[PDB]
Amino acid sequence: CRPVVIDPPHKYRPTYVGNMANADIAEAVDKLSLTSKQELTINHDVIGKKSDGDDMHLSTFFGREAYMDRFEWKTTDSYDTLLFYTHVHPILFKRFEATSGDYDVGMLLPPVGYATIPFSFWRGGMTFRFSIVASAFHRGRLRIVYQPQGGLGTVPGFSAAFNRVIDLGDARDFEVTVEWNQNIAFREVHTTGSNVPSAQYTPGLDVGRTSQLPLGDQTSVSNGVLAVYVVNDLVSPDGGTDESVEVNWFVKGAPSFEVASRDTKFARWSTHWSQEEF
Amino acid sequence: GAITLEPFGSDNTSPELSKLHFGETYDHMRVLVKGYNFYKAVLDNTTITDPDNPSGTVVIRSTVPDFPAPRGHIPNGPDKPFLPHPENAALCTHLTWFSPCYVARRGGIRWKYLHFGARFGATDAPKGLGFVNRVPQVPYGRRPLGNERLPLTDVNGFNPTELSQAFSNENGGVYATDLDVQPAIEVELPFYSSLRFVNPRWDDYEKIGIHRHSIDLLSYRTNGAKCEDAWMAYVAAGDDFNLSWMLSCPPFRLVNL
Amino acid sequence: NFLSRPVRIMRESISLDERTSTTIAPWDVYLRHPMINKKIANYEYLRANLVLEVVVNGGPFFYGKMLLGYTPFGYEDSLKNFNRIPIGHQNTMLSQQPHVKIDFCESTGGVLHLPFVYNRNYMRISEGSGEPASMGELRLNTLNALKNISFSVATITVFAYLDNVELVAPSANDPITAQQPEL
């Protein structure tokens, strides 16, 4: 009360509800703790298994393999017949029905497509892996063709421009990586409207799809198309040629995958699926 | 075998791409989960079915768990808990989407409550007082989850006897404010458990609700047969929030209430 | 020592052209083996790591695929629902968790180190303690059916043993009641 304050008056803005957009600005909040500097540890080893690094980094989702489904060869196949057709975007839905109990439904996504779904743009390469489950006395030959844009609505030429050939006489496990090649820099993220999504690959023996015709066109969300064609139909040491063999594939994300700005499309979704449809 | 074929193309991205199309880089979930999302709205419409609810200058109390729960018809839903299918009327935030993939969860949670509400019929009343307080664990006498309406008036006027039995000792921690000059509460809730971590894949309301907290509102000229008061919940992740082991991505579906 | 000796915990016979899925809980199946149920007779708490190992018996005339996955502590909550998902979709999730792939043509298997992950500090083993059962489970299901070249049965066996053992708090309480594995 002794002196008088001689200081220029400053200009301030009163904020009631704070800044709820950024993530690198300190907050004006109160901790309901006995002390202002209480904190646990952020280490992961305190619970058990040693961690390989940061288990909260997003690269742990881009880089975990997942079995999607399987298709079949059916050796009664001519010189060039379609066996597999898929787009090259990471949102590959997989519906199912409850076996025992009341009627229930649900979807399922690979780790690549479960982490990019909150965001709105995606970019990078994805690696597919094929494994044929067959005996060692089997001989056949297939080819893989990649079309960056448009699609493969008709059987293409055998040219070696982008064709990779795989034969059963060498091995039965292959893996290829489709990398980013588009004029634009970022594609969009696919979404579904109803509880039964549309097919992004054919055929599938798990979901019950038996179609073997090329699909539609989704160029705004996909990196292209990948199709599998037969070259030399396989023969088994049985004589009775009325049999088949199946082959299954896995999807991952190459160490160049990345995402972009945030999005809100999972607002009306929930991970609890087992008590609806009354 | 495992033959690596020839890649379809090559990656030759410029080292300066984060400053040509977007502003920054989105690769860490820990940073992303620190923004705010909109959770449900905390109403109180379960109690109005009573035939003797107080009317006029009462205390509205709601006890809720301090972690978001998945939406839908979860086992112990709060919204309509007196009919065969109770439900949760929230939205799937970023916390309740990336969590079910993990094994261990530990850390504090940040909440923001914003008050609103009119008085249908009569003109209006000044906004009362708002409190947020922790509910700690006790072997006997703990506050159950749900809503309650306590009266604090007598034949003459305010009575300290029923006023003291509406507020507990308030020792664990509290934040109190006047809603006329500051209609918002921003709070942080720590972990405070005797066992190292909890299971993120829980879906029953009560199993999550072993860590509770309460929101209290003092109101004037209310009605015992209609609720006109609410809060707006915004949930973020605290500084010590941690998820430890990524197991697998669970299934989901599209649910409309 | 004596607890580092491999012990058979499950044996399965695989038919032709079948899609099946079975499941067990290795932690208490191992602990109830009568050869083991006596060397932990007078303690109260245990802490160790299981070490599983799969041995496949199949000739070069077979071709098929199987998957053996392991789910850690906390599966009891989401178990009545996980038994409703069809096998093909189960393999999608099961192939991301720590697992081993069974190939019949090459007759190959593997080994699998199970870590000790628990919210408490020790595991209680005394006459009714349900903690060992609710600690982690094994699920074995077909990836592709089993076929052969004709011009009928294959077996899978799992041997388990734990190392890095610490036993504390000697007491006067009976351990969990010993059970002979069904196999």
Side-chain angles (χ1 to χ4, degrees):
Chain A
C1 279
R2 317 94 191 167
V4 69
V5 285
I6 289 108
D7 254 18
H10 285 329
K11 267 146 78 164
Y12 283 160
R13 180 171 204 265
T15 68
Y16 296 147
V17 191
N19 190 8
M20 28 171 70
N22 300 52
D24 46 322
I25 299 169
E27 282 216 67
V29 84
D30 39 27
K31 189 186 291 292
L32 300 189
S33 74
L34 186 75
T35 325
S36 68
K37 284 182 321 313
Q38 79 99 23
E39 54 163 273
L40 312 178
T41 42
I42 43 148
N43 220 28
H44 302 283
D45 310 336
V46 312
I47 80 162
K49 50 182 299 297
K50 308 249 158 190
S51 148
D52 303 337
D54 205 323
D55 216 69
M56 262 187 107
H57 201 285
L58 265 187
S59 80
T60 80
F61 285 77
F62 321 138
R64 186 154 298 184
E65 214 174 340
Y67 154 88
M68 271 303 300
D69 80 19
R70 57 198 211 284
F71 57 109
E72 49 104 24
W73 198 325
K74 196 173 294 299
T75 176
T76 321
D77 277 8
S78 72
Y79 155 65
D80 47 334
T81 46
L82 187 62
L83 291 189
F84 188 44
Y85 192 87
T86 185
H87 307 304
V88 187
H89 66 289
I91 315 288
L92 310 151
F93 288 109
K94 172 165 199 192
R95 209 186 82 107
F96 69 84
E97 297 269 2
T99 44
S100 315
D102 275 9
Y103 192 77
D104 275 327
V105 297
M107 268 90 79
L108 192 43
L109 274 164
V112 197
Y114 198 88
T116 70
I117 208 186
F119 307 103
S120 203
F121 293 109
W122 75 272
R123 173 194 211 278
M126 310 166 48
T127 83
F128 296 5
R129 164 155 91 73
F130 297 87
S131 73
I132 303 105
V133 56
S135 167
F137 314 130
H138 282 253
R139 312 272 142 176
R141 207 182 273 248
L142 304 161
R143 78 182 205 245
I144 318 164
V145 296
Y146 172 50
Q147 172 78 357
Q149 202 265 354
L152 288 158
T154 54
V155 179
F158 188 75
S159 292
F162 257 134
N163 291 34
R164 312 265 188 278
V165 188
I166 35 168
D167 61 347
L168 263 163
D170 193 355
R172 300 162 300 212
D173 314 277
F174 322 104
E175 77 157 356
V176 80
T177 84
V178 176
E179 218 147 6
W180 185 255
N181 38 13
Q182 304 259 305
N183 44 0
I184 214 167
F186 276 94
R187 285 274 163 214
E188 275 171 49
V189 172
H190 182 226
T191 203
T192 168
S194 80
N195 228 358
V196 55
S198 67
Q200 308 291 272
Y201 61 89
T202 51
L205 291 186
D206 288 341
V207 292
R209 265 199 286 286
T210 57
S211 171
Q212 217 159 188
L213 322 176
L215 284 147
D217 205 4
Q218 316 212 245
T219 42
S220 42
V221 303
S222 59
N223 195 17
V225 78
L226 203 71
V228 161
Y229 290 100
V230 68
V231 178
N232 314 328
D233 47 342
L234 88 166
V235 283
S236 68
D238 202 66
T241 306
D242 206 355
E243 81 205 60
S244 67
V245 68
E246 64 204 22
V247 51
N248 37 22
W249 49 291
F250 313 84
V251 192
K252 196 213 301 283
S256 82
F257 207 102
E258 83 177 54
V259 286
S261 78
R262 302 179 262 154
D263 196 311
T264 74
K265 52 187 172 283
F266 52 82
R268 326 284 181 188
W269 301 356
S270 72
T271 61
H272 171 79
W273 62 268
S274 89
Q275 274 313 311
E276 272 67 20
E277 277 163 337
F278 290 137
Chain B
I3 309 143
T4 310
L5 297 191
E6 271 315 329
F8 289 125
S10 271
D11 50 326
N12 46 351
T13 175
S14 294
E16 61 301 16
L17 187 72
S18 68
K19 64 152 160 273
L20 210 166
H21 268 90
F22 296 95
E24 71 285 41
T25 70
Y26 306 68
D27 61 343
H28 220 299
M29 170 201 162
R30 170 162 279 146
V31 161
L32 153 77
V33 84
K34 266 169 207 160
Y36 272 79
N37 281 42
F38 174 67
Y39 196 59
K40 63 176 288 147
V42 185
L43 261 64
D44 167 26
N45 51 9
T46 88
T47 43
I48 39 177
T49 194
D50 269 308
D52 53 353
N53 249 7
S55 294
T57 321
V58 304
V59 154
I60 296 312
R61 192 189 315 272
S62 283
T63 319
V64 285
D66 42 20
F67 196 80
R71 60 176 262 139
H73 303 259
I74 52 177
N76 279 306
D79 290 327
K80 39 184 96 146
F82 310 134
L83 47 91
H85 298 307
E87 72 148 41
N88 203 41
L91 304 170
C92 184
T93 69
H94 58 312
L95 272 172
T96 175
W97 175 263
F98 270 89
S99 301
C101 321
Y102 283 88
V103 164
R105 165 167 76 80
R106 60 208 305 268
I109 302 289
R110 272 157 187 197
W111 291 86
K112 281 186 186 171
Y113 294 95
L114 173 64
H115 169 263
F116 79 94
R119 294 279 185 276
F120 320 134
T123 75
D124 74 4
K127 316 164 191 168
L129 321 167
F131 323 104
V132 156
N133 53 343
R134 274 182 77 247
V135 174
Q137 315 195 31
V138 288
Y140 164 100
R142 210 197 187 174
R143 189 174 290 142
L145 283 165
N147 302 305
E148 73 207 345
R149 227 149 181 159
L150 306 105
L152 59 94
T153 46
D154 218 348
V155 191
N156 285 316
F158 284 144
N159 187 39
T161 294
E162 50 244 69
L163 194 32
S164 77
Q165 64 190 0
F167 297 92
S168 186
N169 195 9
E170 282 215 29
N171 193 24
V174 70
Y175 179 80
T177 185
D178 193 355
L179 305 188
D180 304 293
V181 313
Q182 163 84 0
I185 300 167
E186 321 175 22
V187 284
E188 158 99 349
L189 300 162
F191 195 25
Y192 281 1
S193 80
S194 51
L195 44 82
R196 308 169 144 159
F197 54 81
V198 287
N199 177 62
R201 301 204 183 197
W202 270 333
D203 68 321
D204 189 17
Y205 201 70
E206 311 216 0
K207 258 181 264 153
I208 304 138
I210 65 149
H211 288 61
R212 287 186 255 272
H213 70 264
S214 189
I215 314 108
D216 317 274
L217 164 90
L218 206 156
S219 41
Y220 320 95
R221 213 155 46 231
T222 70
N223 196 311
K226 185 43 161 142
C227 58
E228 58 283 41
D229 275 330
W231 300 82
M232 200 138 286
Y234 289 81
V235 50
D239 222 23
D240 47 42
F241 193 73
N242 203 9
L243 301 147
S244 286
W245 187 7
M246 211 288 265
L247 203 60
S248 67
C249 312
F252 57 87
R253 73 162 267 162
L254 196 144
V255 48
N256 50 342
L257 296 129
Chain C
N1 304 327
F2 214 114
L3 282 191
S4 83
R5 291 301 185 72
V7 165
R8 208 169 54 178
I9 78 176
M10 71 161 326
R11 178 194 177 95
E12 283 277 310
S13 160
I14 283 150
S15 166
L16 279 189
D17 288 18
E18 281 304 55
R19 322 279 311 289
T20 58
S21 79
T22 89
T23 169
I24 63 163
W27 278 98
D28 80 325
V29 161
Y30 177 83
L31 273 184
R32 294 197 169 169
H33 190 53
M35 194 259 252
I36 311 288
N37 206 246
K38 286 180 208 206
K39 296 299 174 176
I40 54 154
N42 273 344
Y43 286 100
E44 178 72 289
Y45 304 123
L46 171 77
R47 178 180 185 180
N49 315 309
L50 256 192
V51 180
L52 303 165
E53 153 152 69
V54 183
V55 163
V56 191
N57 179 241
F61 278 45
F62 293 116
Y63 49 96
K65 281 274 183 41
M66 218 148 262
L67 185 92
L68 180 88
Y70 162 72
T71 87
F73 166 58
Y75 70 94
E76 300 256 30
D77 313 308
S78 48
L79 179 57
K80 176 71 162 222
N81 294 324
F82 200 81
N83 286 358
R84 287 171 78 198
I85 298 168
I87 310 186
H89 298 71
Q90 295 188 13
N91 305 131
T92 304
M93 292 193 257
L94 223 61
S95 84
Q96 322 176 17
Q97 312 168 357
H99 66 302
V100 62
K101 347 178 188 191
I102 302 171
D103 192 6
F104 283 112
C105 174
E106 272 197 26
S107 283
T108 186
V111 295
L112 194 73
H113 282 62
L114 301 194
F116 188 71
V117 167
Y118 201 37
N119 56 6
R120 251 214 79 192
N121 213 335
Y122 293 113
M123 217 215 292
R124 188 177 85 90
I125 48 184
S126 304
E127 209 208 330
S129 162
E131 323 199 325
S134 74
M135 181 95 188
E137 99 164 338
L138 281 185
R139 213 182 254 281
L140 174 128
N141 36 22
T142 84
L143 202 51
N144 296 115
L146 179 75
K147 314 223 181 293
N148 71 329
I149 314 174
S150 57
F151 276 8
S152 172
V153 161
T155 89
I156 295 316
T157 303
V158 184
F159 298 103
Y161 80 95
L162 45 86
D163 63 337
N164 285 17
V165 201
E166 337 182 6
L167 291 143
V168 303
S171 78
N173 213 7
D174 283 328
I176 40 181
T177 291
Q179 193 74 0
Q180 183 64 28
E182 281 215 30
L183 300 199

